Amino acid sequence: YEAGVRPYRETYYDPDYEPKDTDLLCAFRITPKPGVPMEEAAAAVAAESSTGTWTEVWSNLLTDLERYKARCYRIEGDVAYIAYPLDLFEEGSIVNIMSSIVGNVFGFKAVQALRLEDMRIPVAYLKTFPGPPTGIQVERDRLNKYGRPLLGGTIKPKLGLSAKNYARVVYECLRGGLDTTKDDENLNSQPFNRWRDRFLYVMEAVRKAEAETGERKGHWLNVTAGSTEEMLKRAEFAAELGSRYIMVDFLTAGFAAFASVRRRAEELGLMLHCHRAMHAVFDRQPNHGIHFRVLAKWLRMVGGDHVHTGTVVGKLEGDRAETLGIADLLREDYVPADPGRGLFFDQDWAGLKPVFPVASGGIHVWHVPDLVSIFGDDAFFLFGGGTHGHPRGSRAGATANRVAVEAVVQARNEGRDILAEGREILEEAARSCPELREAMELWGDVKF
Amino acid sequence: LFEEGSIVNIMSSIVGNVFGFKAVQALRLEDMRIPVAYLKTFPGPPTGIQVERDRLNKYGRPLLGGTIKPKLGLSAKNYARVVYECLRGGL
Amino acid sequence: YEAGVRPYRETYYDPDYEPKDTDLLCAFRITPKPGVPMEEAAAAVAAESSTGTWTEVWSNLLTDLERYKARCYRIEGDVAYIAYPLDLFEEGSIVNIMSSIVGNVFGFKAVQALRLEDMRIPVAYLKTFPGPPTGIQVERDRLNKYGRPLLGGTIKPKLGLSAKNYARVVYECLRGGLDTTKDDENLNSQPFNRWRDRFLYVMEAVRKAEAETGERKGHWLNVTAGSTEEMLKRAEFAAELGSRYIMVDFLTAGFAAFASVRRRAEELGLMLHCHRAMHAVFDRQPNHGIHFRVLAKWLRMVGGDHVHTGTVVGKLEGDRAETLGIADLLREDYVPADPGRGLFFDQDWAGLKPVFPVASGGIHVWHVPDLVSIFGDDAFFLFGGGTHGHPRGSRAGATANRVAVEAVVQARNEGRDILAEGREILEEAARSCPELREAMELWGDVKFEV
Amino acid sequence: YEAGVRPYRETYYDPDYEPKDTDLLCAFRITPKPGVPMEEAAAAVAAESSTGTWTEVWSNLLTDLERYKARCYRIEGDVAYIAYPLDLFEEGSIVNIMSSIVGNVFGFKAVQALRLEDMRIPVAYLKTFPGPPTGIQVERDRLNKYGRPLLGGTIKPKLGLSAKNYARVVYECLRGGLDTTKDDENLNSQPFNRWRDRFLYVMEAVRKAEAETGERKGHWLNVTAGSTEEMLKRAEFAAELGSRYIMVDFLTAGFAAFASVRRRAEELGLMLHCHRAMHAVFDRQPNHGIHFRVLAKWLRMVGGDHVHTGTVVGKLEGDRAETLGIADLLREDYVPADPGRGLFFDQDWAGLKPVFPVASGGIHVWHVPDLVSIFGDDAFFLFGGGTHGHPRGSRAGATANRVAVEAVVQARNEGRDILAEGREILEEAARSCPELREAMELWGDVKF
């Protein structure tokens, strides 16, 4: 035992290390404090997210640090690759992953900025997680909807509507062609609209629209609440009322409560929509934070049936290439590494069910060719303002959006170039659909 | 606009989506004034500083603690041996 | 520390204090013992309802009495205004409010009579209460009834009917046009009519009436009982049978058990009717007690869907101007002070749901013009004797009262002065409704003062 | 069936009726509206508290009103006696008694003022009530205290003390000679003193004083709360901490919740102190309300172990003769009617256990001779201000009060007249008790 402070790289930088198939790997983009070499910064991140601290400790001799320490094994420019032994992690706990990988290392004086770009989850650790309870294929069977993207939309105004008026908007949307509707992420239980009231009114509107159209419908009832117990109570009630879906803000509620709700959702027969409120607080900036592709891996592991992924073309930020990679991570059994899409590692999903991507935010009929081109059939397209903002209201707006999606789907199956011929496809459909003609006219000038 | 007693609801509105808009390149929430009428729907700490000092019977100084190291890798038995030495020594 | 007895006035009278928006305020009408000045009596009430006792105590120095004491901050004649800091009260407990405000101060030798006239509940404290489970607007959607007062009535005789005969009366009333019917406040479970039998027979009567009229119907099944556990058991059974409503005597059962029943009603999806039995024991006399407007505020805070407010014109006492104020306290988002109605403070309701006023007691068809003029549309009018006492029985009586209310409402919406033209509006309807004509003939000479 | 309004007197006034042993009887003092004969006003009370309403109903023919109606069978000046058949009441429910007897009859225009003076509870109905769970004799055995009144006191200031300072006052009081101490009626759980903290701090003080004095001690922890469930939760916690007592405001909490708390108390082995907060809102005025002796009967039926009865000589109102009757009602097996004490009926108690009277409110050492003379040994005397207001604090004050009571009990047992020689008895004890001397000097001029 030699007391005193030693540089982190002496023990935690090992560019000769060859990662094992059981290791958990991380890709960190590091911005060191000026004067701190890149190797010392990367080693500090590895040390203080595994086994080390700022000075040597006599208790190091009571353990086999060679077995348990993480190691930065490769540095490519400002990107550091770090490997973590399988034994460092608690089985089935995303919370534990976060507490090591992003626990303290983002606040060190020696590392000015730090962003976790990707993470390789090893198969041996994935087997301790359940994944989604329903999955794309079973959900299409439960809805009896095949061969196209599914239609949805957030009820607006976000807040302020009574339960009665809120449910009237739901009825109008579903009656007009939307497959689903949803509560806004911030609509929980408030003085103007208490959750029990909303749940009762809405399911009556869902049943009515379902009877009148002859198509199956659902509404994503938000159970997000201040405690795990209250969320479970709201899920139990939605199931009692015969709802197909519930909704949870998995990041604001948090991963521990999220896991509790996901377990209860499967026991009640509910499908689980996951809203990513708060994600942009730490996945927006390229120099610091956690990229959403990491959050999307954690989401699939705990087990959401959908998660929002961005629209690329809408009102919220999202890169086309990164979004395409995120969609594969959510839907495929195996995703090869792809630098062109920001995927730093191959990801085997070990038989876990796939998650529905969900595109929402500032989109309207003119975006439908782009969206089909980006996502294909296996996705939800959500039209909030794009439905209720129609000159003739939600019902007319729902019809315009549903017809647009089916026109572009039919064109693709016929082999046409849906981007090169996008407007032509929408104009042919508008000739037999007055509601689509009016939507194209109102928003023809709205671009982001 | 807010659900009584729910921090989760506050976050869902205030930091829900507004950090990812194309029109706003960066955004930082600096402070927040919680009104008294809303605070009263929250319980606050279960113990509190004064009751805790009574339970510890320690007054008139900062209190001493420390994180067991190495972070990970110690057996349960060796972990508790480190604990004992620290507490026996004055922490 | 200086031991010994000091006048309450020295510490608990502060005419310079400016109430805070978080303070709870009371208006007391005080009748001091002769020889005791008003200021000393008012300070005694403030002292012994907050922090003080009859002599100085060394332990006053272990706390900041400046922060917690109540203060009488204004006196006008025999009215005393007292302010209580927000931190003196337990969140969400009417029981605690009463324990301080009306706990011991009504029994002091130095204060010969005491009446609490009004109370200002601050917004910061209201937010700790849930309010009504359903509320007027949700309830109208659950019933599918709009644009008129709702019709009800107590089943008579109060006691003695078998469960089977009890339900037969219910059926006749609902079949004849009443929207609801109710158990008498004193009908709980008795040898001549046990609660399980009554609930079963009655719900069968309600379903038959709904099917024959094509209108939604309800009955207010009284779950009042000797213990909280028994009341909850009876509520569970009412929900199992599909009842839309339950009923509780919130004062005789008490506020603690009332809170328990209100919570379970929301969980069960039941609407909660509240009967104010016992209120007159302490809200009647002008010199001593608690004015009903305070009880109504507490009622809305705990959360009842309806509460009886009186009729003004019926067999039970009630003042018109005071009732108008009470009706606003139950239904409106904000009620400004109004000395003419006895509203001593502005009352903000902080988004709590509203409560249905219920007018009941010794009323009949001739009172309908006055009832509509007083309450408007958002109210229940209950006719017990006024229904079963009809010459041809309950079904005919229910038809007569229903038609009367719909005619007075129509005439009002047509712009007529229903008070100046009340008799004419009723006589016009009678020409097309034999039941109403005969009800008007029977009770035309039955009047109560006002 | 003859429709129309009839005078209440025709059916509900019967001066030839003989009350049965199974009838519940009431004595009402009635102030009719000017112009309403006394017989009509009494008939109206009988009718609208049993079976009648304001007009004849066809459904009367479906019922045997002769079997079930109440009847005014006697009028003596402005006092009306009314008999109610046993079958009108629900077994074991004070709530049902109130809903009939005092439900609506106090608010009729025809009766300008109404006061219920006394009530004869028949033995056949009493057998459906459990009565106190402990009782005076069992309680004295649990405390191991005999041959004197018991000492208590409310902690002061009423509100504002932290839990720590609160338990310090408790410790001084018990260490000084008080048998018990109690929370104020309005101390429940508040931001300055939460109930969990208070229960923990106080029980530590109780055990500490118990060990230093060698006598058994107790504190009346207030479980009064806004809902039945919360009160039961607090009672469970008191029992878990090994408390001998809990306390409930049985009127502000309400009788239904009171019954719930009484049942749980017996199951938990707790003795139940009952505070009568709010009683003066309806029992103070002689023209309108309910006399406390009625509430005292209902209290013993549900089963409180103590209840406050007033001091007569203190700061709160109370008539001596009426107080002597109320104590007999609470303690004796059978109480015969007595016009000099306001007892309108004989009351058989059917074997129910007796209740401890509790005298409290503005009393000090000079009142002890009167209190012993009034109540005898089986009572609590509570000194709040009379303890903490001592020139030298709570321990000194508790000593002065304990010494005074034992000096007076000692003089009585020797055959001295404790009232004629009260001053001499206290002065003799003060010669050897400086704490008593200082209390006598401090409060010698304080009289009510």
Ligand SMILES: O=C(O)[C@@](O)(COP(=O)(O)O)[C@H](O)[C@H](O)COP(=O)(O)O
């Ligand atoms: O709150 C909103 O703005 C939305 O309801 C969109 O409403 P419109 O349909 O009216 O735009 C969605 O929650 C966002 O799209 C979420 O963003 P993301 O999908 O990127 O998490």
Ligand SMILES: O=C(O)[C@@](O)(COP(=O)(O)O)[C@H](O)[C@H](O)COP(=O)(O)O
């Ligand atoms: O018991 C009764 O007398 C009633 O059923 C009325 O019967 P009628 O309809 O036959 O008069 C009601 O409970 C009273 O109106 C309550 O008084 P309030 O509404 O003033 O609390």
Ligand SMILES: O=C(O)[C@@](O)(COP(=O)(O)O)[C@H](O)[C@H](O)COP(=O)(O)O
């Ligand atoms: O709050 C109070 O005033 C007391 O704590 C007395 O304190 P002191 O001992 O300082 O007077 C008691 O609650 C009253 O005696 C109750 O009145 P009753 O016994 O008549 O119900």
Ligand SMILES: [Mg+2]
């Ligand atoms: Mg949204």
Ligand SMILES: [Mg+2]
């Ligand atoms: Mg009634």
Ligand SMILES: [Mg+2]
């Ligand atoms: Mg007290």
